[PDB]
Design an enzyme around this catalytic site. Structure first.
Site, PDB file in Angstrom:
ATOM      1  CG  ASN A 190      -3.581   2.865  13.458  1.00  0.00           C
ATOM      2  OD1 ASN A 190      -2.356   2.988  13.488  1.00  0.00           O
ATOM      3  ND2 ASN A 190      -4.371   3.765  12.894  1.00  0.00           N
ATOM      4  CD  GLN A 221      -7.899  11.249   5.008  1.00  0.00           C
ATOM      5  OE1 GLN A 221      -7.777  12.477   4.828  1.00  0.00           O
ATOM      6  NE2 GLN A 221      -8.364  10.735   6.141  1.00  0.00           N
ATOM      7  CE1 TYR A 268       0.778   7.756   3.677  1.00  0.00           C
ATOM      8  CE2 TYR A 268       2.852   7.133   2.607  1.00  0.00           C
ATOM      9  CZ  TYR A 268       1.654   6.780   3.224  1.00  0.00           C
ATOM     10  OH  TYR A 268       1.342   5.469   3.429  1.00  0.00           O
ATOM     11  CB  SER A 278       0.233   2.689   4.097  1.00  0.00           C
ATOM     12  OG  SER A 278      -0.851   3.627   3.830  1.00  0.00           O
ATOM     13  CG  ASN A 284      -4.135   6.543   1.048  1.00  0.00           C
ATOM     14  OD1 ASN A 284      -3.006   6.099   1.298  1.00  0.00           O
ATOM     15  ND2 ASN A 284      -5.142   6.502   1.937  1.00  0.00           N
ATOM     16  CB  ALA A 310      -2.235   2.448   9.977  1.00  0.00           C
TER      17      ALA A 310
HETATM   18  B1  LIG Z   1      -1.238   4.300   5.175  1.00  0.00           B
HETATM   19  O1  LIG Z   1      -0.247   5.374   5.478  1.00  0.00           O
HETATM   20  O2  LIG Z   1      -1.216   3.278   6.278  1.00  0.00           O
HETATM   21  C1  LIG Z   1      -2.731   4.939   5.036  1.00  0.00           C
HETATM   22  N1  LIG Z   1      -3.761   3.921   5.250  1.00  0.00           N
HETATM   23  C2  LIG Z   1      -5.069   4.033   4.876  1.00  0.00           C
HETATM   24  O3  LIG Z   1      -5.517   5.031   4.295  1.00  0.00           O
HETATM   25  C3  LIG Z   1      -5.996   2.866   5.219  1.00  0.00           C
HETATM   26  C4  LIG Z   1      -7.032   3.330   6.241  1.00  0.00           C
HETATM   27  C5  LIG Z   1      -8.419   3.162   6.219  1.00  0.00           C
HETATM   28  C6  LIG Z   1      -9.018   3.745   7.380  1.00  0.00           C
HETATM   29  C7  LIG Z   1      -8.127   4.316   8.226  1.00  0.00           C
HETATM   30  S1  LIG Z   1      -6.524   4.176   7.660  1.00  0.00           S
HETATM   31  C8  LIG Z   1      -3.009   6.097   6.025  1.00  0.00           C
HETATM   32  C9  LIG Z   1      -2.782   5.935   7.406  1.00  0.00           C
HETATM   33  C10 LIG Z   1      -3.124   6.938   8.333  1.00  0.00           C
HETATM   34  C11 LIG Z   1      -2.859   6.690   9.797  1.00  0.00           C
HETATM   35  O4  LIG Z   1      -1.740   7.051  10.234  1.00  0.00           O
HETATM   36  O5  LIG Z   1      -3.767   6.106  10.464  1.00  0.00           O
HETATM   37  C12 LIG Z   1      -3.704   8.148   7.865  1.00  0.00           C
HETATM   38  C13 LIG Z   1      -3.927   8.332   6.475  1.00  0.00           C
HETATM   39  C14 LIG Z   1      -3.577   7.318   5.542  1.00  0.00           C
END
Ligand SMILES: *[B]([O])([O])[C]([N]C(=O)[C]C1=[C][C]=[C]S1)C1=[C]C(C([O])=O)=[C][C]=[C]1
EC number: 3.5.2.6
Length: 358
Positions: free
Chosen positions: A340, A117, A147, A61, A149, A315
Protein backbone atom coordinates in the site's frame (compact mmCIF):
# COMPACT_ATOMS: atom_id res chain seq x y z
CA UNK A 1 3.28 -5.26 -27.52
CA UNK A 2 3.94 -2.03 -29.46
CA UNK A 3 7.38 -0.73 -28.47
CA UNK A 4 5.87 2.64 -27.51
CA UNK A 5 3.70 1.04 -24.84
CA UNK A 6 6.52 -1.20 -23.63
CA UNK A 7 8.89 1.72 -23.26
CA UNK A 8 6.63 4.18 -21.46
CA UNK A 9 5.34 1.43 -19.15
CA UNK A 10 8.81 0.12 -18.23
CA UNK A 11 10.44 3.56 -18.01
CA UNK A 12 7.71 4.64 -15.57
CA UNK A 13 7.06 1.52 -13.51
CA UNK A 14 10.64 0.39 -12.97
CA UNK A 15 11.64 3.55 -11.04
CA UNK A 16 8.33 3.46 -9.15
CA UNK A 17 8.96 -0.06 -7.81
CA UNK A 18 12.48 0.93 -6.75
CA UNK A 19 11.42 4.20 -5.12
CA UNK A 20 8.49 2.61 -3.31
CA UNK A 21 10.11 -0.76 -2.62
CA UNK A 22 7.07 -2.58 -4.04
CA UNK A 23 7.56 -6.38 -3.77
CA UNK A 24 5.52 -7.26 -6.84
CA UNK A 25 3.34 -5.51 -9.37
CA UNK A 26 1.19 -6.15 -12.43
CA UNK A 27 0.09 -3.54 -14.96
CA UNK A 28 -2.30 -3.66 -17.88
CA UNK A 29 -2.59 -0.90 -20.45
CA UNK A 30 -5.70 -0.85 -22.60
CA UNK A 31 -4.76 0.80 -25.88
CA UNK A 32 -7.28 1.25 -28.68
CA UNK A 33 -9.35 -1.39 -26.89
CA UNK A 34 -6.64 -4.07 -26.65
CA UNK A 35 -4.92 -5.09 -23.39
CA UNK A 36 -1.16 -5.35 -22.89
CA UNK A 37 0.27 -6.92 -19.74
CA UNK A 38 3.40 -6.41 -17.66
CA UNK A 39 4.56 -7.94 -14.38
CA UNK A 40 7.44 -7.52 -11.94
CA UNK A 41 8.72 -9.08 -8.77
CA UNK A 42 7.14 -11.37 -6.24
CA UNK A 43 3.65 -12.39 -5.21
CA UNK A 44 5.25 -14.29 -2.30
CA UNK A 45 8.75 -13.25 -1.24
CA UNK A 46 9.43 -16.15 1.13
CA UNK A 47 8.31 -18.76 -1.40
CA UNK A 48 9.88 -17.01 -4.40
CA UNK A 49 6.61 -17.03 -6.38
CA UNK A 50 6.68 -14.42 -9.16
CA UNK A 51 3.83 -12.13 -10.04
CA UNK A 52 2.15 -13.48 -13.24
CA UNK A 53 -0.94 -12.43 -15.25
CA UNK A 54 -2.87 -14.98 -13.14
CA UNK A 55 -1.77 -13.59 -9.74
CA UNK A 56 -4.65 -12.43 -7.51
CA UNK A 57 -4.27 -9.05 -5.77
CA UNK A 58 -6.55 -7.47 -3.14
CA UNK A 59 -8.29 -4.58 -4.93
CA UNK A 60 -9.21 -2.88 -1.69
CA UNK A 61 -11.42 0.14 -2.47
CA UNK A 62 -11.36 -0.46 -6.24
CA UNK A 63 -14.03 -2.97 -5.10
CA UNK A 64 -16.37 0.02 -4.71
CA UNK A 65 -16.50 0.26 -8.51
CA UNK A 66 -17.98 -3.22 -8.64
CA UNK A 67 -20.44 -2.35 -5.89
CA UNK A 68 -21.43 0.79 -7.76
CA UNK A 69 -22.01 -1.12 -11.01
CA UNK A 70 -23.93 -3.91 -9.24
CA UNK A 71 -26.09 -1.23 -7.65
CA UNK A 72 -26.62 0.39 -11.07
CA UNK A 73 -27.64 -2.96 -12.51
CA UNK A 74 -30.25 -3.28 -9.71
CA UNK A 75 -31.58 0.17 -10.61
CA UNK A 76 -31.75 -0.82 -14.29
CA UNK A 77 -33.67 -3.97 -13.35
CA UNK A 78 -36.24 -1.80 -11.56
CA UNK A 79 -35.39 -3.48 -8.25
CA UNK A 80 -34.35 -0.27 -6.46
CA UNK A 81 -34.21 3.50 -7.09
CA UNK A 82 -31.50 5.89 -5.90
CA UNK A 83 -34.30 8.19 -4.71
CA UNK A 84 -35.63 5.46 -2.35
CA UNK A 85 -35.39 6.15 1.42
CA UNK A 86 -32.90 3.95 3.30
CA UNK A 87 -35.80 2.86 5.51
CA UNK A 88 -37.56 1.25 2.56
CA UNK A 89 -34.99 -1.56 2.84
CA UNK A 90 -34.11 -1.38 6.56
CA UNK A 91 -37.44 -0.34 8.18
CA UNK A 92 -35.65 -1.06 11.47
CA UNK A 93 -33.63 2.14 11.03
CA UNK A 94 -36.16 4.05 13.12
CA UNK A 95 -33.81 6.71 14.59
CA UNK A 96 -34.93 10.16 13.32
CA UNK A 97 -31.60 11.05 11.71
CA UNK A 98 -32.40 8.51 8.98
CA UNK A 99 -35.39 10.48 7.79
CA UNK A 100 -34.39 11.94 4.44
CA UNK A 101 -31.33 9.74 3.83
CA UNK A 102 -31.71 7.96 0.50
CA UNK A 103 -29.78 5.24 -1.35
CA UNK A 104 -28.20 8.01 -3.43
CA UNK A 105 -26.73 9.58 -0.27
CA UNK A 106 -25.30 6.23 0.83
CA UNK A 107 -23.80 5.41 -2.55
CA UNK A 108 -22.10 8.78 -2.90
CA UNK A 109 -20.86 9.42 0.66
CA UNK A 110 -23.27 12.37 1.14
CA UNK A 111 -25.53 10.98 3.90
CA UNK A 112 -24.12 13.42 6.46
CA UNK A 113 -20.86 12.11 7.82
CA UNK A 114 -21.17 8.32 8.04
CA UNK A 115 -17.68 7.19 9.24
CA UNK A 116 -14.77 6.16 7.03
CA UNK A 117 -14.51 2.82 8.82
CA UNK A 118 -17.05 0.50 10.38
CA UNK A 119 -15.79 -0.16 13.92
CA UNK A 120 -14.04 -3.49 14.48
CA UNK A 121 -16.51 -4.29 17.25
CA UNK A 122 -19.35 -4.21 14.73
CA UNK A 123 -19.76 -7.67 13.26
CA UNK A 124 -23.29 -9.13 13.13
CA UNK A 125 -26.41 -7.85 11.43
CA UNK A 126 -27.83 -6.73 14.81
CA UNK A 127 -24.45 -5.02 15.56
CA UNK A 128 -24.67 -3.25 12.26
CA UNK A 129 -28.26 -2.11 12.95
CA UNK A 130 -27.22 -0.76 16.34
CA UNK A 131 -24.24 1.07 14.84
CA UNK A 132 -26.30 2.96 12.23
CA UNK A 133 -29.13 3.68 14.71
CA UNK A 134 -26.61 5.26 17.08
CA UNK A 135 -24.71 7.25 14.43
CA UNK A 136 -25.20 11.02 14.65
CA UNK A 137 -24.85 12.97 11.39
CA UNK A 138 -22.60 16.00 11.40
CA UNK A 139 -24.45 17.57 8.47
CA UNK A 140 -27.81 17.41 6.74
CA UNK A 141 -28.13 14.86 3.88
CA UNK A 142 -26.74 15.92 0.51
CA UNK A 143 -24.59 18.80 1.71
CA UNK A 144 -21.18 17.31 2.38
CA UNK A 145 -19.07 14.42 1.01
CA UNK A 146 -17.04 12.28 3.40
CA UNK A 147 -15.59 9.20 1.65
CA UNK A 148 -16.67 6.23 3.78
CA UNK A 149 -16.80 2.44 3.78
CA UNK A 150 -19.82 2.58 6.08
CA UNK A 151 -21.69 4.60 3.46
CA UNK A 152 -21.25 2.79 0.13
CA UNK A 153 -20.91 -0.47 2.08
CA UNK A 154 -24.47 -0.06 3.38
CA UNK A 155 -25.62 0.95 -0.10
CA UNK A 156 -24.27 -2.33 -1.45
CA UNK A 157 -26.00 -4.46 1.15
CA UNK A 158 -29.30 -2.75 0.58
CA UNK A 159 -29.05 -2.64 -3.19
CA UNK A 160 -29.12 -6.44 -3.41
CA UNK A 161 -32.05 -7.02 -1.03
CA UNK A 162 -34.90 -7.24 -3.56
CA UNK A 163 -32.91 -9.69 -5.71
CA UNK A 164 -33.17 -12.28 -2.95
CA UNK A 165 -29.47 -13.06 -3.42
CA UNK A 166 -26.56 -12.61 -1.01
CA UNK A 167 -24.24 -9.73 -2.04
CA UNK A 168 -21.59 -12.21 -3.23
CA UNK A 169 -24.08 -14.29 -5.24
CA UNK A 170 -25.55 -11.17 -6.86
CA UNK A 171 -22.07 -9.94 -7.77
CA UNK A 172 -21.06 -13.33 -9.18
CA UNK A 173 -24.28 -13.80 -11.16
CA UNK A 174 -24.87 -10.26 -12.33
CA UNK A 175 -21.41 -8.84 -12.88
CA UNK A 176 -18.52 -11.34 -12.74
CA UNK A 177 -20.11 -14.13 -14.83
CA UNK A 178 -21.61 -11.98 -17.61
CA UNK A 179 -18.28 -10.15 -18.05
CA UNK A 180 -16.19 -13.35 -17.93
CA UNK A 181 -14.29 -12.22 -14.86
CA UNK A 182 -13.70 -15.90 -14.04
CA UNK A 183 -10.73 -15.19 -11.74
CA UNK A 184 -12.31 -12.44 -9.65
CA UNK A 185 -13.47 -13.29 -6.12
CA UNK A 186 -15.00 -11.90 -2.94
CA UNK A 187 -13.77 -15.08 -1.21
CA UNK A 188 -10.68 -16.78 -2.73
CA UNK A 189 -11.39 -20.52 -3.23
CA UNK A 190 -8.82 -23.03 -1.96
CA UNK A 191 -8.03 -24.08 -5.58
CA UNK A 192 -6.94 -20.52 -6.33
CA UNK A 193 -4.83 -19.93 -3.24
CA UNK A 194 -1.70 -20.78 -5.21
CA UNK A 195 -2.23 -17.58 -7.21
CA UNK A 196 -3.12 -15.35 -4.27
CA UNK A 197 -0.30 -12.88 -3.65
CA UNK A 198 0.66 -11.91 -0.12
CA UNK A 199 0.31 -8.23 0.74
CA UNK A 200 3.26 -6.61 2.55
CA UNK A 201 3.00 -4.21 5.44
CA UNK A 202 6.18 -3.19 7.22
CA UNK A 203 7.80 -6.23 5.65
CA UNK A 204 5.29 -8.74 7.02
CA UNK A 205 3.11 -10.87 4.68
CA UNK A 206 -0.57 -10.12 5.24
CA UNK A 207 -4.03 -10.71 3.79
CA UNK A 208 -7.15 -8.66 4.41
CA UNK A 209 -9.08 -9.60 7.57
CA UNK A 210 -12.81 -10.29 7.79
CA UNK A 211 -14.84 -7.17 8.59
CA UNK A 212 -18.42 -5.92 8.48
CA UNK A 213 -19.32 -4.83 4.95
CA UNK A 214 -15.90 -5.96 3.75
CA UNK A 215 -17.34 -7.55 0.58
CA UNK A 216 -19.27 -4.40 -0.29
CA UNK A 217 -16.56 -1.84 0.47
CA UNK A 218 -13.12 -3.38 -0.12
CA UNK A 219 -13.29 -7.18 -0.48
CA UNK A 220 -12.64 -8.10 -4.08
CA UNK A 221 -9.51 -9.88 -5.27
CA UNK A 222 -8.66 -10.12 -8.97
CA UNK A 223 -6.00 -10.77 -11.63
CA UNK A 224 -4.49 -8.19 -13.96
CA UNK A 225 -6.29 -9.96 -16.86
CA UNK A 226 -9.73 -9.77 -15.30
CA UNK A 227 -9.10 -6.17 -14.27
CA UNK A 228 -8.17 -5.30 -17.86
CA UNK A 229 -11.52 -6.85 -18.90
CA UNK A 230 -13.20 -4.75 -16.20
CA UNK A 231 -11.63 -1.59 -17.69
CA UNK A 232 -12.70 -2.64 -21.24
CA UNK A 233 -16.29 -3.14 -20.03
CA UNK A 234 -16.43 0.28 -18.36
CA UNK A 235 -14.73 1.87 -21.41
CA UNK A 236 -17.35 0.48 -23.83
CA UNK A 237 -20.50 -0.54 -21.97
CA UNK A 238 -22.38 -0.67 -25.28
CA UNK A 239 -20.48 -3.83 -26.26
CA UNK A 240 -22.06 -5.62 -23.26
CA UNK A 241 -24.99 -7.90 -24.12
CA UNK A 242 -26.85 -8.00 -20.82
CA UNK A 243 -29.10 -4.94 -20.97
CA UNK A 244 -29.33 -4.04 -17.29
CA UNK A 245 -25.57 -4.46 -16.81
CA UNK A 246 -24.81 -2.18 -19.76
CA UNK A 247 -27.13 0.37 -18.17
CA UNK A 248 -25.69 -0.25 -14.71
CA UNK A 249 -22.17 0.60 -15.89
CA UNK A 250 -23.52 3.76 -17.50
CA UNK A 251 -25.31 4.78 -14.31
CA UNK A 252 -22.16 4.30 -12.20
CA UNK A 253 -20.34 6.81 -14.40
CA UNK A 254 -23.10 9.45 -14.20
CA UNK A 255 -22.11 12.63 -12.34
CA UNK A 256 -24.18 13.05 -9.16
CA UNK A 257 -22.20 15.62 -7.17
CA UNK A 258 -19.34 17.97 -7.75
CA UNK A 259 -16.55 19.01 -5.38
CA UNK A 260 -13.65 20.99 -6.76
CA UNK A 261 -12.98 19.62 -10.24
CA UNK A 262 -14.13 16.10 -9.25
CA UNK A 263 -17.51 14.43 -9.86
CA UNK A 264 -18.86 11.54 -7.80
CA UNK A 265 -20.34 8.51 -9.58
CA UNK A 266 -21.37 5.17 -8.06
CA UNK A 267 -17.95 3.92 -6.94
CA UNK A 268 -16.09 5.55 -9.83
CA UNK A 269 -14.96 9.19 -9.53
CA UNK A 270 -14.61 11.38 -12.65
CA UNK A 271 -12.95 14.57 -13.93
CA UNK A 272 -13.34 16.28 -17.30
CA UNK A 273 -10.69 15.28 -19.79
CA UNK A 274 -8.21 16.74 -20.40
CA UNK A 275 -7.45 16.88 -16.70
CA UNK A 276 -4.79 18.85 -14.91
CA UNK A 277 -2.37 16.12 -13.72
CA UNK A 278 -1.57 18.06 -10.54
CA UNK A 279 -5.27 18.06 -9.78
CA UNK A 280 -5.76 14.28 -9.90
CA UNK A 281 -2.31 13.57 -8.49
CA UNK A 282 -2.59 15.88 -5.46
CA UNK A 283 -6.29 15.06 -5.25
CA UNK A 284 -5.52 11.38 -4.71
CA UNK A 285 -3.57 12.06 -1.51
CA UNK A 286 -5.66 10.95 1.48
CA UNK A 287 -5.27 14.46 2.93
CA UNK A 288 -7.79 15.53 0.28
CA UNK A 289 -9.47 12.27 -0.77
CA UNK A 290 -10.58 11.48 2.81
CA UNK A 291 -11.51 15.07 3.77
CA UNK A 292 -15.04 16.40 4.39
CA UNK A 293 -15.97 18.69 1.49
CA UNK A 294 -19.14 20.55 0.65
CA UNK A 295 -20.75 19.28 -2.56
CA UNK A 296 -22.90 20.79 -5.27
CA UNK A 297 -25.78 18.55 -6.40
CA UNK A 298 -25.88 17.97 -10.17
CA UNK A 299 -29.60 18.23 -10.78
CA UNK A 300 -30.29 16.02 -12.63
CA UNK A 301 -27.14 13.86 -12.82
CA UNK A 302 -25.10 14.15 -16.03
CA UNK A 303 -25.05 10.87 -18.04
CA UNK A 304 -21.63 9.26 -18.41
CA UNK A 305 -19.39 11.77 -20.19
CA UNK A 306 -17.07 10.13 -22.71
CA UNK A 307 -14.45 12.88 -22.34
CA UNK A 308 -13.62 11.98 -18.73
CA UNK A 309 -10.72 10.59 -16.73
CA UNK A 310 -12.62 7.94 -14.73
CA UNK A 311 -10.71 6.36 -11.83
CA UNK A 312 -10.49 4.84 -8.35
CA UNK A 313 -7.66 4.15 -5.91
CA UNK A 314 -7.87 1.18 -3.59
CA UNK A 315 -5.94 -0.17 -0.65
CA UNK A 316 -5.85 -2.87 1.99
CA UNK A 317 -3.21 -3.15 4.70
CA UNK A 318 -0.87 -4.90 2.29
CA UNK A 319 -2.03 -3.88 -1.21
CA UNK A 320 -2.25 -0.72 -3.34
CA UNK A 321 -4.31 -0.63 -6.54
CA UNK A 322 -5.33 2.01 -9.10
CA UNK A 323 -7.53 1.98 -12.22
CA UNK A 324 -8.01 4.89 -14.61
CA UNK A 325 -9.53 5.13 -18.07
CA UNK A 326 -10.65 7.66 -20.70
CA UNK A 327 -13.71 6.41 -22.68
CA UNK A 328 -13.22 8.87 -25.51
CA UNK A 329 -9.73 7.48 -26.25
CA UNK A 330 -10.41 3.75 -25.60
CA UNK A 331 -7.43 4.09 -23.29
CA UNK A 332 -6.99 2.76 -19.74
CA UNK A 333 -4.60 1.36 -17.17
CA UNK A 334 -4.71 -0.94 -14.13
CA UNK A 335 -1.86 -0.99 -11.59
CA UNK A 336 -1.94 -3.74 -8.95
CA UNK A 337 0.72 -4.01 -6.25
CA UNK A 338 1.27 -5.94 -3.02
CA UNK A 339 2.27 -2.90 -0.97
CA UNK A 340 0.00 0.00 0.00
CA UNK A 341 2.21 2.85 -1.33
CA UNK A 342 1.18 6.55 -1.66
CA UNK A 343 -1.77 7.28 -3.94
CA UNK A 344 -0.03 10.30 -5.47
CA UNK A 345 2.72 8.09 -6.85
CA UNK A 346 0.13 5.73 -8.38
CA UNK A 347 -1.72 8.49 -10.19
CA UNK A 348 1.45 10.29 -11.33
CA UNK A 349 2.70 7.05 -12.91
CA UNK A 350 -0.72 6.39 -14.53
CA UNK A 351 -0.77 9.95 -15.89
CA UNK A 352 2.74 9.67 -17.36
CA UNK A 353 1.74 6.46 -19.14
CA UNK A 354 -1.69 7.50 -20.44
CA UNK A 355 -0.55 11.04 -21.32
CA UNK A 356 2.25 9.51 -23.39
CA UNK A 357 -0.20 7.28 -25.27
CA UNK A 358 -3.06 9.69 -25.79
B1 LIG B 1 -10.36 2.14 0.27
O1 LIG B 1 -10.33 3.63 0.13
O2 LIG B 1 -9.11 1.56 -0.34
C1 LIG B 1 -10.44 1.74 1.85
N1 LIG B 1 -9.96 0.37 2.07
C2 LIG B 1 -10.21 -0.38 3.18
O3 LIG B 1 -10.90 0.02 4.12
C3 LIG B 1 -9.59 -1.78 3.23
C4 LIG B 1 -8.56 -1.83 4.35
C5 LIG B 1 -8.41 -2.79 5.36
C6 LIG B 1 -7.30 -2.46 6.21
C7 LIG B 1 -6.66 -1.32 5.85
S1 LIG B 1 -7.35 -0.60 4.47
C8 LIG B 1 -9.63 2.67 2.78
C9 LIG B 1 -8.27 2.94 2.52
C10 LIG B 1 -7.49 3.70 3.41
C11 LIG B 1 -6.04 3.95 3.07
O4 LIG B 1 -5.79 4.97 2.40
O5 LIG B 1 -5.20 3.08 3.46
C12 LIG B 1 -8.09 4.22 4.59
C13 LIG B 1 -9.46 3.97 4.86
C14 LIG B 1 -10.25 3.20 3.96
Amino acid sequence: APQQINDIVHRTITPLIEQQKIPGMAVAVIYQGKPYYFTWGYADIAKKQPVTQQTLFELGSVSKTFTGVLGGDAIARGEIKLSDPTTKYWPELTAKQWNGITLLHLATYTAGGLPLQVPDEVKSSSDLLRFYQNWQPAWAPGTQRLYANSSIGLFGALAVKPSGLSFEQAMQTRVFQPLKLNHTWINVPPAEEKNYAWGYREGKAVHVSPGALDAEAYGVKSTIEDMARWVQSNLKPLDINEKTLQQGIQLAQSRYWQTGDMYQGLGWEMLDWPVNPDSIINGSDNKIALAARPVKAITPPTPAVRASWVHKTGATGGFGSYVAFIPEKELGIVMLANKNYPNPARVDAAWQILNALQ
